[PDB]
Write a protein that binds this DNA or RNA. Structure first.
Lengths: 539, 738, 517
RNA sequence: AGUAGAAACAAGGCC
RNA sequence: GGCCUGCU
């Protein structure tokens, strides 16, 4: 009633009539931003300079009927003068503290619910457990780490529609919330905020912060989880490590680690089946995680892992920028390449066809507990530097780079029974078979690679056959460095194809993923994975 | 003994103490008066570095333009803007050859953006030269005034609410024989007309200003601000250029400081460690002199034409328009000049527009020479600036050219034992050239210099040097066998930010935590930063512990609050309470840190929605503060904070009351009143900007009708009220139609 | 389906045709040329034709290559700071009142009453271009006003000043010229452009080095009391607290921290009086609260300021004020340092002497000065110096703790074994402990804030580059340049008249002399 | 006068 | 003498 009367006044006024008739709804935002007020070039000087004047603050005009004109000492608390481009009135800051000492009171039980994230941060810190300070060289690796620790893994656009459906259910538009996760999130969030009386703009902002995922490049050592990055100013330094345990855990860490385990198990089964893709799809449909189905997470969740990527692509979803090989994630960074479809022999005299690439090319190898950088040419490796944590990590990176190089020094180092076919005359992949052969131990590949000199620049460490650092002469091209750059986080989402046997391929024709790159490791899910097809023990 | 801190560098390397060489604790140098002199100087310089070019007279603007592209080749090591179109195109071709499909994909992305993009995004911008008032005005104010003048003249396609339609309207505005603008005096307004040439020079012109708070230079520089017509085309061009630079491992401009450091470290390591021990490798940590002056918009048009190869023609035109306008861009001279008569003891402000006519008795020899050189180019108070870019509007395309020249040393194109690679961010580069001997290094650096002078990219010998690989500098990042912390660039961010009490507290603690994360700030230094920030906070905002005897104008309310409260550890530093912040608690706001210690009465007074102090306008500004970093571009600081009674907005300048444009305040007031009513009708007007193509009143009445019917069917509204509402709905519709 | 149609036509077509290389007349022909363009070895061809003279020959950089930096010649440089640094004197009352817990005017009256020995003031060192009797009359007016405040029952929190001709002159009142329209003043003879010339050249003097030497010295008082922080719960918090305790112990007794506090107080007071009372003149005492080593708190009065009017619009607009400071330093032993100062003789002082009592005279340095909003804002934040300095120290400490896997704060701060070159004696370079380094960097930073100028920024950058060239040479990384004498001319382009910049240049010359060996 | 340094303040407009 | 403004 009050608003329509205001409209009565607006339509009666000619100037208002002008603005209302000519302006469109599209320009309402522009007219919301229409202001003479220039933005402060030096805000500090202008908030230091103004706080020495009477009436430096502004407030709504209702202050005139809520706060008195002066306090007991006689200091004036508000004036009748109005702001420049507003109806608001100029008031001193003593009206604020007066409000805090003599103003109306309310019930702030809503605010913990509103600012949920901040209170989980406080509770996690209050219950955390510190330990010994360990002074030691800190190898800080720049890496993409999620900052928000209660993020429901929804993008800004993805979660703004859930926020609207929760708070503004009639202004959602054509966007239909397909995913089950979104509908559960909607109902649950709707329930807590049934009567919240703070502000729908700040309720929406809070829900955005809580539900919207956020990632930020940060130098990280030690733990990478989300609860471990909010305290990165406290756990990790340049010369000191601080042992610390979060008091709590978040659903996103569990959702991620359980999705990874589920997809790994699914792919492991699907590989031995007759039609891996059909089995994979049927398993992905008949399975769910923590009640919410897994496909919802698969469309909703961005996660970097070979099995998750295979699952997503099999569901026709977008995947990572560059290929995987031997459990490591390679991203090319220079040069072109063409395959050749050529033939060669081994040291055990077995003949094999492979595809060797052309041109000089640089690559950014990546992994779980290591990192590396590679430069090579047609059939020829040029150099490989590694930045792993443990020595066996550097060994893994070096053997992976040598197999990837397709050098004859590696081909002519194969000794023993290495069958390049299955037990039924089925052609396995040569590269993967070499990588499994050289994974028992590569003594001969190390003793046959070669040696070169080094300039001893940067104090870089030498290579190790059997734990013998050599600081002046070492294998050719292979170096080791303290500290790595990670790099791969930026992702140029590439389009791809998939074979029946789960061979991912880019638009060109090269191979990007395969069921052999997924780990052989057997983990234990953090959230309960529930599979209902006929037998509840097959995953 | 006389003390000398520089001798400290005889034991500690210069990179492990470089913070000592940064005098960032004192007032930054500022300009005081007009920037006309620097504008004239820059125009005459950029017309000097291209003087062997060809002159022309524009048939549309009448301006004399100097075109140096495909001009003669340079003969000395002085600056030159004679870029070669064939060489730029060859650079682009080799870039595409080394990174295939990059231009196709970038054009597809930018086409999607063009199809999706809207007009409201132009409100998110810096100061913009309004061409209706000839005055710098906020981006939204300038956009609104331009839209109003367009609709008053006849250009009305923009109701579509698309940026490309606003650009079509800008293009059809130029083919009209007379615009109609409005001018204020002192209170009313007056209609005025602008023939085609006048409107053309107003749409193509740029405003000029002096750049304050710049660290590292004795002499002041000028900067430009474009109008509303160029802003959309330059936005689209920067979208394309960002999309391209994102897919290049050699660019560094679209990424942050940490990604710059990552790229730099990978490149220096690659050129050092990956290269063989037999090869030598040398790093030139260089800069480019007169970068913007020598960057012709015609070669940017060539780059846009190449990048868009085999793309739709509409996309080609929309991206070509911006280089076309920059090639013809004009520069407003500035504020003018002040003249003092000492004998008569008086001062006088002459506007710059009279300089075309003013006698030259009143100027010093330097200014006399500048005016004499610029007068031929002066047309109606503005100087034709065709021969070169003014200040970094096309930054990312320049970075693309730098990455092309850096990519032309891949060793497939040099065809020689030497090669090179590096990282370039506009006006700053690091180039590691690897070669088997010092003759190869010299040949590589000579070919780099020469290939850089054939593309209009000049290398600063004054600011570049070559050493062996392992130590270098890039954008004040000092790499010495690993990156090193500086902390002197980040020093001006360690005080009160000047937004409000809550915001200043949150920003200070978050800046401390960030400087702890990225720039290796220590634990003791972080604690000291907390303590000093809190002292400055308390002294600025007049909020002392409350158990003190500091007599201020705001010491009485704080004492009453201190005495009223039983639990005193629950008060905020803004209300006269203790400081519970430490290293463990840098990631938590000041309201959640103190929530179990607060009294329920104080807790409910502080956190109250009915307060007259808290106002929030849009979701974008709720917790984001534009913070200008020193020796860097103005950034945006996300600051986690809790909405309390301390989260006010501060007052406005209030000088506009004494000027002819005083009636803009009433427009502001009505606009905000109306928008508040619309938000009442549409609750989500603040969160999500409304879209459609309907006049506001029709939506208002339609929502009123829906609300009334719903309320009557099952709500408070009774039949009499519903009838009255529907009667007014009909009355309003009739009034609107009339 | 609707096909999009973005058509260039009319004016923006013609402007389009006039925006190409010179051998083209239409965008369509240029676009066709590009679409048919295929690389055919064009860069190499043009390159060969391009003359050899265009090159980037690398000039080697050796020990004998870098020459010293030339400094300007001219009359000696004069003090620019807004208050006296080493020549300052303190009256005290020993009152247990924290940093701000007082009424500045009441504190000032108490710190002035404790001195007996006042005489009729007379001028000792005149201005040589002004009228010193007006400064004398202004001093006498300040004394009269202080006695008036004393007589009045309640000390005013803020005192206004009368607008006499001495203060109207000394504060620049009715000195600006009137603003008129150019069409009403055209034929005036002396109407001309503002003077825009090179600043007056000035050579380095002996005093900025003694000032820097004394700024790095210890003192008999504490100058920093820090806000409270939370209780330390983690071990790294205890480590940080012990580090900070060492830092503050070494740094709290240092003249640089005294200058930090002086400047912060003075700029706060000046800004607040300027914003609050814009038309009135205002008396502002210079107060600083220390705490002697025994533990008693002490208040200290340095003098008085008299803020003129302050109708400051731009951040560069100037507010004028008259500064008066007590001192014991005779102005007739370094008169070139006091070019802009008037110096009176106001009293006598008997300090604790073993040769009876000395009775050294006591002078008042009076001057007109000015400040801006930005200079005030940046001088209210001199505490940032404490951060930069201590941060660098902490960096060093951590850089050594990383090498030896153990905490090393105690060894450095107590055992004093490590020594960093921190200044050259006639015998040679002499090294000092970590505390001297801390105080030296603090004094550098404080001075940089006090004497901040564009010359300092420029010189800092252009000498950073040369420092890096010398470091590349020191690391045996065969460094080289392309135009080094020009780079020197670019460094020397910034040495004009600023004492701090000339001193930094002298330091750089000494560093180049002692390095490269 | 002073601040400051490539152009400004050292108050501005309105009655 | 009275009001207005202090980045317009």
């Amino acid at each position: 009633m009050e608003r329509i009367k205001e409209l009565r006044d607006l339509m009666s006024q000619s100037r208002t009539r002008e603005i209302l008739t000519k302006t469109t709804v599209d320009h309402m935002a522009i007219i919301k931003k229409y202001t003479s007020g220039r933005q402060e070039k030096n805000p500090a000087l202008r908030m230091k300079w103004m706080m020495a004047m009477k009436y430096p603050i502004t407030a709504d005009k209702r202050i005139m009927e809520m706060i008195p004109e002066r306090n007991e000492q006689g200091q004036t608390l508000w004036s009748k003068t109005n702001d420049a481009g507003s109806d608001r009135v100029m008031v001193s800051p003593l009206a604020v503290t007066w409000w805090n000492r003599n103003g109306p009171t309310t019930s702030a039980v809503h605010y913990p619910k509103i600012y949920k994230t901040y209170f989980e941060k406080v509770e996690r810190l209050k219950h955390g457990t510190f330990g010994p300070v360990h002074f030691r060289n800190q190898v800080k690796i720049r890496r993409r780490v999620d900052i928000n620790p209660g993020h429901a893994d929804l993008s800004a656009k993805e979660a703004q529609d859930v926020i609207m459906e929760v708070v503004f259910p009639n202004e959602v538009g054509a966007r239909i919330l397909t995913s089950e996760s979104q509908l559960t999130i909607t109902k649950e969030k709707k329930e807590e905020l049934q009567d919240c009386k703070i502000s729908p703009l700040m309720v929406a902002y809070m829900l955005e912060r809580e539900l919207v995922r956020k990632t930020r490049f940060l130098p990280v050592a030690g733990g990478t989880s989300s609860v471990y990055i909010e305290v990165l100013h406290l756990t990790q330094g340049t010369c000191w490590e601080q042992m610390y345990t979060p008091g709590g855990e978040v659903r996103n860490d569990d959702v991620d680690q359980s999705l990874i385990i589920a997809a790994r198990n699914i792919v492991r089964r699907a590989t031995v089946s007759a039609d891996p893709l059909a089995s994979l799809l049927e398993m992905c449909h008949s399975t769910q995680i923590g009640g919410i189905r897994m496909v919802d997470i698969l469309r909703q969740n961005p996660t970097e892992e070979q099995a998750v990527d295979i699952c997503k692509a099999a569901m026709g979803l977008r995947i990572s920028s560059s290929f995987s090989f031997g459990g490591f994630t390679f991203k090319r960074t220079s040069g072109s390449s063409v395959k050749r479809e050529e033939e060669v022999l081994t040291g055990n005299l077995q003949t094999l066809k492979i595809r060797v690439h052309e041109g000089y090319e640089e690559f950014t190898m990546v992994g779980r507990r290591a990192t590396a950088i590679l430069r090579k040419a047609t059939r020829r490796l040029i150099q490989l530097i590694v930045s792993g944590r443990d020595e066996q990590s550097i060994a893994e990176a070096i053997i992976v780079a040598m197999v990837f190089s397709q050098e004859d020094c590696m081909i002519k180092a194969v000794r023993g029974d290495l069958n390049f076919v299955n037990r039924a005359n089925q052609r396995l992949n040569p590269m993967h078979q070499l990588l499994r052969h050289f994974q028992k131990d590569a003594k001969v590949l190390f003793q046959n690679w070669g040696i070169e000199p080094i300039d001893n620049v940067m104090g870089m460490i030498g290579i190790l056959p059997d734990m013998t650092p050599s600081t002046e002469m070492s294998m050719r091209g292979v170096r080791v460095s303290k500290m790595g750059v990670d790099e791969y986080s930026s992702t140029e989402r590439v389009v791809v194809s998939i074979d029946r046997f789960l061979r991912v391929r880019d638009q060109r024709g090269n191979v990007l993923l395969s069921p052999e790159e997924v780990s052989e490791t057997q983990g234990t899910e953090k959230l309960t994975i529930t599979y209902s097809s006929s037998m509840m023990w097959e995953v | 003994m006389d003390v000398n801190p520089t001798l400290l560098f005889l034991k500690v390397p210069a990179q492990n103490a470089i913070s000592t060489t940064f005098p960032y604790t004192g007032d930054p140098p500022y300009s005081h008066g007009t920037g006309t002199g620097y504008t004239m100087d820059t125009v005459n310089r950029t017309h000097q570095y291209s003087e062997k070019g060809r002159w022309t007279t524009n048939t549309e603007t009448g301006a004399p333009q100097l075109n140096p592209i495909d001009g003669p080749l340079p003969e000395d090591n002085e600056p030159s803007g004679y870029a070669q179109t064939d060489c730029v195109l060859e650079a682009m071709a080799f870039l595409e050859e080394s990174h295939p499909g990059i231009f196709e994909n970038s054009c597809l992305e930018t086409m999607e953006v063009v199809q999706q993009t809207r007009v409201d995004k132009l409100t998110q911008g810096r100061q913009t030269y309004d061409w209706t008032l000839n005055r710098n005005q906020p981006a939204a104010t300038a956009l609104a005034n331009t839209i109003e003048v367009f609709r008053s003249n006849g250009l009305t396609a923009n109701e579509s609410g698309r940026l490309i339609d606003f650009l079509k309207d800008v293009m059809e505005s130029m083919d009209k024989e007379e615009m109609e603008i409005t001018t204020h005096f002192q209170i009313g307004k007056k209609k005025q007309r602008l023939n085609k040439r006048s409107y053309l020079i107003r749409a193509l012109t740029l405003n000029t200003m002096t750049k304050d708070a710049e660290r590292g230079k004795l002499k002041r520089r000028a900067i430009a601000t474009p109008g509303m017509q160029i802003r959309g085309f330059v936005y689209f061009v920067e979208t394309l250029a960002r999309s391209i630079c994102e897919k290049l491992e050699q660019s560094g401009l679209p990424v942050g400081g940490n990604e710059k450091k990552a790229k730099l470290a990978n490149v220096v390591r690659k050129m050092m460690t990956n290269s063989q021990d037999t090869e030598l490798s040398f790093t030139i940590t260089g800069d480019n002199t007169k970068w913007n002056e020598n960057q012709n918009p015609r070669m940017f048009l060539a780059m846009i034409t190449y990048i868009t190869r085999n793309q739709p023609e509409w996309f080609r035109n929309v991206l070509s328009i911006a280089p076309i306008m920059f090639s013809n861009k004009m520069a407003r001279l500035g504020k003018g000049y002040m003249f003092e008569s000492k004998s008569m003891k008086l001062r006088t402000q002459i506007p710059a527009e009279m300089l075309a006519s003013i006698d030259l008795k009143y100027f010093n020899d330097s200014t006399r020479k500048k005016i004499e050189k610029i007068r031929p180019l002066l047309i109606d108070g503005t100087a034709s600036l065709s021969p070169g870019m003014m200040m970094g509007m096309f930054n990312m395309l320049s970075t693309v050219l730098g990455v092309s020249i850096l990519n032309l040393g891949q060793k497939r194109y040099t065809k020689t034992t030497y090669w090179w690679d590096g990282l370039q961010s506009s006006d700053d580069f690091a180039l590691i050239v690897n070669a088997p001997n010092h003759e190869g290094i010299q040949a590589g650096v000579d070919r780099f210099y020469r290939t850089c002078k054939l593309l209009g990219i000049n290398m600063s010998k004054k600011k570049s040097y070559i050493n062996r690989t392992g130590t270098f500098e890039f954008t004040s990042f000092f790499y010495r066998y690993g990156f090193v912390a500086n902390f002197s660039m980040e020093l001006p961010s360690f005080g009160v930010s000047g937004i409000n009490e809550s915001a200043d507290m949150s920003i200070g603690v978050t800046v401390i935590k960030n400087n702890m994360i990225n720039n290796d700030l220590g634990p003791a230094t972080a604690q000291m930063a907390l303590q000093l920030f809190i002292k400055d906070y308390r002294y600025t905002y007049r909020c002392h512990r409350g158990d003190t005897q500091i007599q201020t104008r705001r010491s009485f309310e704080i004492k009453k609050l201190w005495e009223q409260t039983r639990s005193k550890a629950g008060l905020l530093v803004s209300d006269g309470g203790p400081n519970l912040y430490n290293i463990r608690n840098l990631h938590i706001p000041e309201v959640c840190l103190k929530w179990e210690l607060m009294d329920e009465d104080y807790q409910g007074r502080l956190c109250n929605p009915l307060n007259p102090f808290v106002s929030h306008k849009e979701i974008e500004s709720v917790n984001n503060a534009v913070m200008m970093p020193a020796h860097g571009p103005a950034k945006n600081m996300e600051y986690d904070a809790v909405a309390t009674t301390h989260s006010w907005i501060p007052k406005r300048n209030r000088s506009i009351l004494n000027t002819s444009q005083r009636g803009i305040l009433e427009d502001e007031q009505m606009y905000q009143k109306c928008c508040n009513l619309f938000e009442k009708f549409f609750p989500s007007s603040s969160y999500r900007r409304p879209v459609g193509i309907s006049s506001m009143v029709e939506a208002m009445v339609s929502r009123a009708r829906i609300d009334a019917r719903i309320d009557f069917e099952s709500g408070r509204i009774k039949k009499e009220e519903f009838a009255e509402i529907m009667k007014i709905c009909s009355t309003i519709e009739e009034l609107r139609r009339q | 389906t609707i096909e999009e149609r973005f058509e260039i036509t009319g004016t923006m077509r013609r402007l389009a045709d006039q925006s190409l290389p010179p051998n083209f007349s239409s965008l369509e022909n240029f676009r066709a040329y590009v679409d048919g363009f295929e690389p055919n070895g064009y860069i190499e061809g043009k390159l060969s034709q391009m003359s050899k003279e265009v090159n980037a020959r690398i000039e080697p950089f050796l020990k004998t290559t870098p020459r010293p930096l030339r400094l300007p010649d001219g009359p000696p440089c004069s003090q620019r700071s807004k208050f006296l640094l080493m020549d300052a004197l303190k009256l005290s009352i020993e009152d247990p009142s924290h940093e701000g817990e007082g009424i500045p005017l009441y504190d000032a009256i108490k710190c002035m009453r404790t001195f007996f020995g006042w005489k009729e003031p007379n001028v000792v060192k005149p201005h040589e271009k002004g009228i010193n009797p007006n400064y004398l009359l202004a001093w006498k007016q300040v004394l009269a006003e202080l006695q008036d405040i004393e007589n009045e029952e309640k000390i005013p929190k803020t005192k206004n000043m009368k607008k006499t001709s001495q203060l109207k002159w000394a504060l620049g009142e009715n000195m600006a010229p009137e603003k008129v329209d150019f069409d009403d003043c055209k034929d005036v003879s002396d109407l001309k452009q503002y003077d825009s010339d090179e600043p007056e050249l000035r050579s380095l003097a002996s005093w900025i080095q003694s000032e820097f030497n004394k700024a790095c010295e210890l003192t008999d008082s504490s100058w920093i009391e820090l806000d409270e922080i939370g209780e330390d719960v983690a071990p790294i918090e205890h480590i940080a607290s012990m580090r900070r305790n060492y830092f503050t112990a070494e740094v709290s007794h240092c003249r640089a921290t005294e200058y930090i506090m002086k400047g912060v107080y003075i700029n706060t007071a000046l800004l607040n009086a300027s914003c609050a009372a814009m038309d009135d003149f205002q008396l502002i005492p210079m107060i600083s609260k220390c705490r002697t080593k025994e533990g008693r708190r002490k208040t200290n009065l340095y003098g008085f300021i008299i803020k003129g009017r302050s109708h400051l619009r731009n951040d560069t607009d100037v507010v004028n004020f008259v500064s008066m400071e007590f001192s014991l330093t005779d102005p007739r032993l370094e008169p070139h340092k006091w070019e802009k100062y008037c110096v009176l003789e106001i009293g006598d002082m008997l300090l604790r002497s073993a040769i009876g009592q000395v009775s050294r005279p006591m002078f008042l340095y009076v001057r007109t000065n000015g400040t801006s909003k930005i200079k005030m804002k940046w001088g209210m934040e001199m505490r940032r110096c404490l951060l930069q300095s201590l941060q660098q120290i902490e960096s060093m400490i951590e850089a050594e703790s990383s090498v030896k896997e153990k905490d090393m704060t105690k060894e450095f701060f107590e055992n004093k074994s490590e020594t960093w070159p921190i200044g050259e004696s006639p015998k040679g370079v002499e090294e000092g402990s970590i505390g001297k380094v801390c105080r030296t960097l603090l004094a550098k930073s404080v001075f940089n804030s006090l004497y901040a100028s564009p010359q300092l920024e420029g010189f800092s950058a252009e000498s950073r580059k040369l420092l890096l060239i010398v470091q590349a040479l020191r690391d045996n990384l065969e460094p080289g340049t392309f135009d080094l004498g020009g780079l020197y001319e670019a460094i020397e382009e910034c040495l004009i008249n600023d004492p701090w910049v000339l001193l930094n240049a002298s330091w750089f010359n000494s560093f180049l002399t002692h390095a490269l060996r």
